[PDB]
Amino acid sequence: APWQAEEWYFGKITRRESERLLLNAENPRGTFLVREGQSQPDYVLSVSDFDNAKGLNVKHYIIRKLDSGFYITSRTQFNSLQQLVAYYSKHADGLCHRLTTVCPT
């Protein structure tokens, strides 16, 4: 099955809809979704983040498309988007927290 059939891919949604869906109080740290860009073209990894000196917020990470490949920073490259999701769901590796649960619809 294609990576777009996956429950964490929300396709074309706004930055507000992303943040409203993720900022449910019933979601743990590390709730995330992959969406299409709105401002900019590349895909976006949208994660919920609890900062002790700020509160509960949403961070947005741009998933740039390698012309060769996907990455958020040029230091960690993945051959597929599912291989990017699977890695960060195990290691923060520069994220505020590791990805734990797929965001509910």
Binding site: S39, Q40, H60, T73, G94
Partner: peptide, 7 residues
């Protein structure tokens, strides 16, 4: 204009 995060 919107803010994204750079690792």
């Amino acid at each position: 204009e919107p803010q994204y995060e750079e690792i």
